[PDB]
Subunit: 509 residues, 4 copies
């Protein structure tokens, strides 16, 4: 009855998964907490089982990771980068099968599952180069015979809590960067993507073990909220990177601040696309489509609000309705399928509640709005017109494929409306106007951390820093100098002289 | 009665100070809150009075500041730098008499008062050059016909809360940097340095108004804990920089996190100097003296722990005693005075309590330990030997001139003892050993934000970032790229083509 | 009959100039070579005289500069920045009278003369901040117990050869940057701007003397081609920065290479403005006017080629002709004069030589083309149409105010025509097309070192690097990390361990 | 007769080598010039033959590379990085046989042969990271409504001339960096390592072919000085990176300067190791051994001068003699030998010339000095004592394994003696003295491009820039921001507004 026992899914054994898998890894595999069974959202059938972490499992792992850190921090950064290079190779090798497991356990379509693993391969290549570059400037002291250098050192143990919707990539960004920065990692994933977490940890463990490194360098404790809270409250967790809901993120931030730890919060988005009158509609429509219905609307970067200039509102909406009706729905691993199930049955419930709440706040469902009559967690991608831009349901961020469409007239008001929500992740404008574009990029433009022009709100590349402002939580991951969040800066002055000139010329005599 | 009414203190009026002064500035001067009188700690005489902010003053000042921000953020950064340049020139012209006011109201000696003002002058020079440099990289997009740029924009209103012990420099570090980054500022100082806050703001307000700019760009609301708490709970304060006690800082970080604001925390230090057997003792003794007794021991970077290797412990301690007994006591505005009073009468009593608790816990007062027989808040700088490194009184947070002296034998134990406290601000080793110095700078060395060699724990220059780790709060000010804390990063992708290739080669069609 | 002996030019004495002035400074003033008289191009009247450098003068000056470098190089860079800050202040206080001398001796209008001095002011401000920043990274060594450091140190003596047309600013750019980088300078300006060079040198010398530093840190040796050739051949001149003709620059470049010195060449430009059909003509016409007739067309960044799309060629030409007729011609110090004389009587001949040649090669003079019958070296700013973009007269760059106008159709061809010339200094397109602008910035776009959009080819700001490609010589001055040309990089590996790991894991034992 | 026709050398076929090989590659393989036979320096037996380029081959190859660049420069940099990544992998997979070919045709020992290929692997890893990073800053313009951007674009065709002694790594540093920067490459190796150049080109060709890219992106034209002179005079070669003799490189720099090309010169080095009295002798002796006898003394970074403090001169010289006696001599393809032959018989003649001159000039051969009585180009590694530091023989340009040992007393004279040579590549001091180490890194310290402490002058790691000063020619390769030499910077100002504010506030009205 488990999918891993059925012959058409034997490929799961290529990831080393079996009927019951250990969900704790700290150099040894184990798990004394509750055995969880994860299910395929496309057909509600059980896949395999994972033994989750008890509290003793959590305690032992943290201790072994900190002991592993003593060895790992002594390994030169470029040699750490060589370990991350080998991880990138292992991922490359299994990108198709790991991508298939993402489609199977998470439910996003095969090209997105593969593409998500590509994000991990990309940031590995990136981190490999970064491991020969991380550091600070040597600066010219104002004092003779003094050297002034900025040093960066690992923070220690980096906890990583990831969400259901990107069960490989978010961990991969945090892992590759933290590792070359000399940190050890502790991973707690979404319980409903535990097989993916195990499969990824199996890949990493083999690399560590082949290199005669302690496996606790990349530790895994599968578990629910109790384990996540433990990490948020654990003084031995120097940096807690949390990707999840804003509500839970806020509490993670508070718990970390109470103990004077470090947090990196990557929280919800309420991302807007803005199509001005001069927009290239052949870019607008397919961009709104990918941003709205990509991943069945389940990215933190999904387009949730579409603002269209009055002159083109009807046409864009009609053109978008026709494109929705061509979306090919099916099993997320099937060829030509563009749209899969929602991840959980509760996500279907939430979708239903949001649709009905949108009607109660005066919206009109112009497309979709219904559960699909078929096995699995399938819902229709939905477009809602007629709501005020400040409608309560629109300012709520729901992980459901519902696109709230609004009219506007002037640039100034629509910038204000992009900015008026609590979230602050991604944003896009479609326009040809050179001046408007740079105003969008400037201090009176978009208040988000991702500020795009003529592309979807989703689909970032890894070379830039990824994250948001406001209620999205302020953390950054991946590229640019996001690596600095995973290290502690020291400002270092060395008197190599036989004198003691004081800063600012102070004569203390 | 008031010092400002006596002819010998007529120089206070060179700073625009009067018998009663407005403590609110926002383009207009006002103050409808409680009137406070500040006192000269060298003689316990009243200096002058300041009309603090009421709640209505605070509310109106924030509204004026955010209005001023609309203008100020539209001003090109180099032109904002020119304003800061002129502020630097204004401090330059007033440096002696501003320094003298710092000595009078706060109580540090004159070279420190002038030196503290000089830090503001220095960060002004630095920020002027920065105003032509701030920003992010243009990155190579993996996508044809796409540009990828990292942009930096002001966060908006920067609230700045400062302490009694650096009543000019800390505000200055924040102000110069926040200004060129296109932010407006709201300053709340220590009530017992209100005259200094008012005087500094009078200097800045004139530059702003001379440049026909709205004064609320650098707003001042003098007040106590209510004003600080209001700023911490106020969504209109985009970034709150807080320098103060660890306990209040923890409460400010929690409040700001509750509303998803940005905080920059600079809290207490419990800084150690470590002297190895190969140390040049002629560097040790004067460095210890200044680090411990400078500012009458009232810096967050004051050396409170002195670790001396067993072989040299008695000789360094004897030499410090002779050095201590030679320091010239007197009024702190008097040139060539080296030792002034503590800031308050309460501090004197807390100094006595610490000296008593040090004796209770086993320690021996080898020098000092008693109040001095003279007007004002004078205490003997004090040396306590014989305690264990883990003695309770030594892990405490006090602004009293007591130096706790410990013995050690080996490198590893004394690095660990340095790191064993809760704070993590400054640290220093004295040694000639090449390898030991690089180990101290590395991942197994000092855990502090400031990591010095053969110099005191105090007296940083502005060109590097200033701040600490662990319970020091994590914030950085002044140099390096601390300016990024005053701005929001955006990662910006611009599709300038007629096509829509997706990141990671994802084919969504 | 000297202008400086007339009462209306008494303001010259505010710069310390006299009837006959010393044109050698090395801490002392002197000059034993030939005496030069400079003439005011607006009336051809002699202004004053300058005693130029003999061979003995040059020898003694280089030696004194190199001896002064031993002191200067030991001053911490921020303290060298403080010197540059005072140079900036001295320039601020004399900006009007210095700009007037630029107008009197060089001949550009007063607003530009003042603007040119502002450039030196601006780069002083930049360099002051840079003096806290210059340096390289600390990198992660692949070898345990090794530090890896990029260090930057002065080259030593920077010779600076400047030209007649920017007789303050180019020296200024080189001066501020070289100084904070720890070099000493030796200046040989254009013979026909000798008083300007003396005036600027007097200003810097006072700052150096007021700071008790050897004046030879900023040495002057006024002279002609003999002194410049000596500098290019002199192994004691570590870096030679030459701004001048392509022809001379090539020989300078060869001579420095022959001796394995460092050269920084800023040579001629043949800058094109290209206006596409969708261009804002309200930006096009003023920008073209400023770029063509600014400085009577004697900048290396002056627009000499104007490509206009066929659809708008006639309209842009007509509007530009009407704009050329608005220009007020007069004495360059007279108010609201926008057009002054050419620098030399020789330039007037070449202008007439160029006009006759353009007609012979088939051009039509639609505006100007004649000498203005008045005192001074006044020629009409000229527009020439109907030539092929590949006509010889158009490629030979000369400083005559002659704009060559060309038609185009395709973006591809006209980008190629921008790039087909031997120089590669500045370039500008006028368009609204978002894709066109980013192609112009890209690898199939402009090949020039300055690549502008919707602005003239002249008028750079100091925050960026300044210089060109191809026959423009390759050097960069002023902003970005141009400072690195004035310093030597060293890559430094420090083994502080007891072991000897080899790079690349090479086992040699 | 040909080794490649002997069964024990069949491993050569694993590299695609044959009895007669094609020495031109531009997408297709050919070569119409002279057929060169390369020989094994360990036994003087012929290996295989290579058809070199005629000038028509060169002509056709340049034209093909320039067409390929039009395609290659359009490929996004991260995608170009992916090609280099696969080049890295292809090298990883062939590291043993390619290292053996280097050992066989060049003559260095196998562990260095492999290690040299490892440098190419390492720089591929670095370049892949870079390919996401290269770019310049976005700068805040002083003008409202203006963007200021520093852009980097490829130079076009990078001609790469390499030398016999590093026949793989030097090309690789240039290749990996030039490739990700969007340039195409044209390689001319040393004629006596023609098989190595063919073998590396075969590896890159397969990668290019497998990725459907034109092979001329990495073109090969094997040949001698006529081909090298052609590249130095060819305006189609935008950058010429030349590694070779000082005298040839000077002429290369002159030819390139004559045509306003870009050159990158990496010439000879007369590198010194300085041993102060406090030096750890257990680090000194092996470092001096490896730095002197590594590669049979044929590195440009080889240690030629060994300065030893008077007090330890005799001891280290005797300790270096006992190390020299332990050198294991034999054929270089053994994975266990330490010392192979010189590359050429003429190097033996030169070596014998220098030893005889050192003895004539008063030196004492204390070790070696003789040819080894076996087949091949074997000389004994030699130590020569008793010469002054300015003895003529010690200031020659000879790749001979002769180490010249000098005495010194104080730090100042010996720093000067390090600096007295014409070249400026590498340098190293052995000391524990902290102040001395920072003095050596500073402005009165070593003048070299590579400045090392307690390690060989040789054996750089790729993270930093590589190259020297003075007669070493000034170019930098590999790490840090050396990638900027392979690109052209542009300073780009974009007016996105409707106004025309001028720099420096010049009102042109
Ligand atoms: N690469 C993805 C990451 C989204 C992460 C998330 O939705 O939580 C994107 O840019 O849309």
């Amino acid at each position: 009855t488990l999918l891993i026992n059925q012959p058409q899914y034997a490929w799961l054994k290529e990831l080393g998964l079996r009927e019951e898998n250990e969900g704790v890894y700290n150099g040894s595999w184990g798990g004394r907490g509750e055995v969880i069974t994860t299910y395929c959202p496309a057909n509600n059938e059980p896949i395999a089982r994972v033994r989750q972490a008890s509290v003793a499992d959590y305690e032992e792992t943290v201790k072994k990771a900190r002991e592993a850190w003593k060895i790992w921090a002594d390994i030169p950064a470029p040699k750490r980068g060589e370990i991350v290079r080998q991880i990138g190779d292992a991922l490359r090798e299994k990108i198709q099968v790991l991508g298939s497991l993402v489609s199977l356990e998470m439910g996003k379509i095969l090209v997105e599952g593969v593409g998500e693993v590509q994000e991990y391969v990309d940031i590995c290549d990136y981190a490999v180069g970064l491991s020969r570059m991380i550091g600070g400037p040597i600066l010219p002291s104002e004092r003779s015979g003094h050297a002034l250098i900025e040093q960066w050192n690992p923070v220690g143990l980096v906890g990583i809590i990831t969400a259901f919707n990107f069960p490989v990539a978010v961990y991969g960004w945090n892992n590759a960067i933290a590792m070359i920065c000399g940190n050890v990692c502790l991973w707690k994933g979404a319980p409903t993507t535990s097989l993916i977490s195990v499969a990824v940890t199996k890949i990493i463990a083999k690399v560590l073990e082949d290199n005669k490194l302690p496996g606790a360098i990349c530790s895994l404790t599968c578990g629910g909220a109790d384990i996540g809270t433990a990490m948020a409250k654990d003084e031995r967790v120097n940096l807690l990177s949390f990707t999840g809901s804003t509500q839970v993120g806020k509490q993670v931030g508070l718990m970390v601040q109470e103990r004077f730890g470090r947090s990196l919060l990557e929280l919800g988005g309420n991302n807007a696309i803005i199509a001005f009158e001069d927009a290239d509609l052949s870019l607008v429509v397919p961009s709104a489509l990918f941003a709205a219905v990509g991943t069945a609307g389940q990215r933190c970067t999904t387009a949730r609000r579409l603002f269209i200039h009055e002159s083109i509102h009807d046409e864009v909406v009609n053109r978008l309705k026709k494109a929705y009706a061509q979306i090919r729905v099916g099993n997320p691993w099937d060829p030509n399928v563009l749209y899969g199930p929602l991840h959980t049955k509760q996500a279907v419930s939430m979708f239903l509640g949001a649709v009905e709440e949108a009607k109660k706040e005066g919206g009109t469902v112009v497309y979709g709005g219904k559960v699909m009559d078929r096995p699995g967690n399938y819902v229709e991608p939905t477009i809602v017109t007629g709501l005020g831009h400040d409608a309560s349901i629109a300012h709520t961020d729901t992980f459901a494929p519902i696109l709230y469409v609004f009219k506007f007239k002037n640039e100034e008001e629509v910038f204000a409306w992009n900015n008026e929500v609590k979230q602050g992740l991604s944003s896009s404008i479609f326009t040809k106007d050179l001046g408007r574009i740079f105003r969008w990029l400037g201090p009176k433009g978009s208040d988000c951390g991702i500020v795009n022009v003529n592309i979807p709100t989703s689909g970032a590349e890894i070379g830039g820093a990824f994250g948001g402002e406001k209620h999205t939580g302020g953390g950054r991951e991946s590229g640019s100098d996001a690596w600095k969040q995973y290290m502690r800066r020291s400002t270092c002055t060395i008197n190599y002289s036989k004198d003691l000139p004081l800063a600012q010329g102070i004569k203390f005599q």
